[PDB]
Chains A and B, each alone.
Chain A
Amino acid sequence: TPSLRGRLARFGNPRKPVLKPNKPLILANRVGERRREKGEATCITEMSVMMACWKQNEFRDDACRKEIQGFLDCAARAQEARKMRSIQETLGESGSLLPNKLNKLLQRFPNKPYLS
């Protein structure tokens, strides 16, 4: 962990400040939400193969059946994988813990930046 001694601008700190945070460097009792990953267009390569075969075969499906089937299978796999990814996000196995359970854990042991 990087040192904080003599970094912030404080009384008794002779040097000019190193860090100028816009928020206090105090741990919050919550973590950020499970940020979604912006979806990218999928099955582009199979679509390209199918379209190139269409261009070579004058958009005749009979000749291109194999590539068309490959593109369709890739599209179905992508849709089913999106559904499975939603299921996995609900499960939370990939991460060490879901943000909700982590927020509960931090609620159980809150930060104490004050005296009592």
Chain B
Amino acid sequence: KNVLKIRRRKMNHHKYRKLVKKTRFLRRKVQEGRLRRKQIKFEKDLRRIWLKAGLKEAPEGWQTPKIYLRG
């Protein structure tokens, strides 16, 4: 068989990689912001969990971990 479909996929992948290389800084900034918002959403969900249960504050000795930070 010919490689026309493979050639189309090859060009698509090459152009995508070049696009990523061109905008690798704005994408990194957007990813950092998304991770921030993701951690915020997780913390809000945990807060909802302990609020619906009647606790006025977080359980004693509990601090929500930063599970999405690079560290």
- Asked whether any CB of A lies within 8 Å of a CB of B in the complex, the reply is no
Residues of B within 8 A of A (CB): none
Residues of A within 8 A of B (CB): none
